[PDB]
Amino acid sequence: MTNQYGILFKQEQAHDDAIWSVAWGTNKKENSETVVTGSLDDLVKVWKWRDERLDLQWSLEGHQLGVVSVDISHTLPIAASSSLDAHIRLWDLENGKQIKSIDAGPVDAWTLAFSPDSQYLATGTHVGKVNIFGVESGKKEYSLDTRGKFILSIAYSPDGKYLASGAIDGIINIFDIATGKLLHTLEGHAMPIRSLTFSPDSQLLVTASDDGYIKIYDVQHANLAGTLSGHASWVLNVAFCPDDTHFVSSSSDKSVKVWDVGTRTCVHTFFDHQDQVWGVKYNGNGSKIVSVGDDQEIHIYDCPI
């Protein structure tokens, strides 16, 4: 009764070492289909899924250490990446050349996330705050503050007006961009969070903590609608479908499952990687999945609409 799932392409060795993050953006109004991936290197290679296969397009690099998160924007041609190098240099994605460089160390940024309108590029600091920079306009207009611990995941509701932040030790903080005042703090899990995502229409917040469970909270109150437990090790990323019916979760047990939120059950599991899977995303009208893994590979799946 489920759909027809299966692989479409398999890149053999994209990078030379582990791949730590991936971002899929169909940014331009025409048919662009650009995939930006970053690894345990300086390389931020920019692939393009053209017709049936991935063709390498850019091999741009300016970093000193491994990149821990990369990001792309849907409006402009642009990308941003941060690393352990204490730099958030953001590339151009058109000429393959650096645009800017912001100095910020592991006490000022861990992971990137652009704005819905591609203007602000919020990142999570060490002392608990969330620092919001300004793209194309300088540095550090303001930082929202939650009195907590190291902060790992940063998400935006894809209509504005909401910002979420998971932390080491579990607690979850939801801010509203309108006033910057903490609405309410969920207590969530007992181990680090390291992934969060809203859903399209921004009324359902899906976490994925370090112990294996996947809470499905609900925004504008603190109601939770259930716990999805089907993994056997850490969960490292969660990407939510364009239509509010499925989401994909990649764990450290070498398997990328795809859940559905209606009945809180797992439809299909992919057993194709051979080591930890550090990144999964959908594409535009969600019908394909990217999964970059610790072993140097880029898998592209086929999830029919």
């Binding site: 009764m1 489920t2 759909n3 027809q4 029919p304």
Partner: protein, 184 residues
């Protein structure tokens, strides 16, 4: 597709209903396929099915039957089978009245005692069309070994006009006489 309605194409063989799916998706628009586990696009207008599934969604409502126009029974000469012939007769009875039927066949003799059954089981008139003389006719040869190195002689015992040739057969057996498993 012109009238906005829906049509269900049903073929008996599980492996035959895949290349039909590909060619019907290539020829025009949306064509869903349904099988034991696959559910490719269960929203299209040319759902391709195995009869054991249509018999399973006729017993319940399934809310697709509200929109049918044609049911294209593809190879209807599998009724003579002993282990699956009951499916075609569980299906041909339960079809509601507004659903027209198209029955492709393979030139059986008693086509008028079958279309009469379906014509008066429902209450609609059914038209029987039967043909002969397939295009690009075929010559049935007979190959008997001789001089396996290069020489190959083929005897014609049936031709493009259906006339049986006994002369060729006698020639073949006589040819075999003169000479008188894996290595041969």
């Amino acid at each position: 597709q012109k009238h906005m309605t829906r049509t269900i194409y049903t073929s008996p063989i599980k492996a035959l209903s895949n290349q039909k799916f590909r060619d019907f998706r290539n020829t025009f628009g949306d064509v869903g396929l349904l099988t034991g586990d696959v559910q490719l696009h269960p929203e299209a207008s040319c759902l391709i099915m195995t009869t054991e599934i249509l018999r399973s969604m006729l017993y319940s409502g399934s809310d697709v039957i509200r929109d049918l126009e044609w049911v294209i029974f593809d190879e209807v000469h599998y009724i003579n089978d002993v282990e699956r012939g009951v499916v075609w007769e569980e299906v041909l009875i339960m079809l509601p009245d507004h659903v027209s039927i198209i029955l492709l066949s393979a030139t059986v003799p008693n086509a008028l005692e079958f279309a009469d059954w379906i014509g008066r089981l429902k209450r609609r008139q059914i038209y029987v069309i039967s043909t002969v003389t397939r295009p690009v006719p075929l010559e049935h040869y007979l190959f008997t070994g001789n001089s396996s190195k290069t020489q190959g002689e083929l005897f014609l015992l049936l031709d493009s006009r259906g006339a049986f040739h006994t002369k060729g057969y006698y020639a073949a057996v006589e040819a075999k006489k003169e000479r008188m498993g894996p290595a041969q």
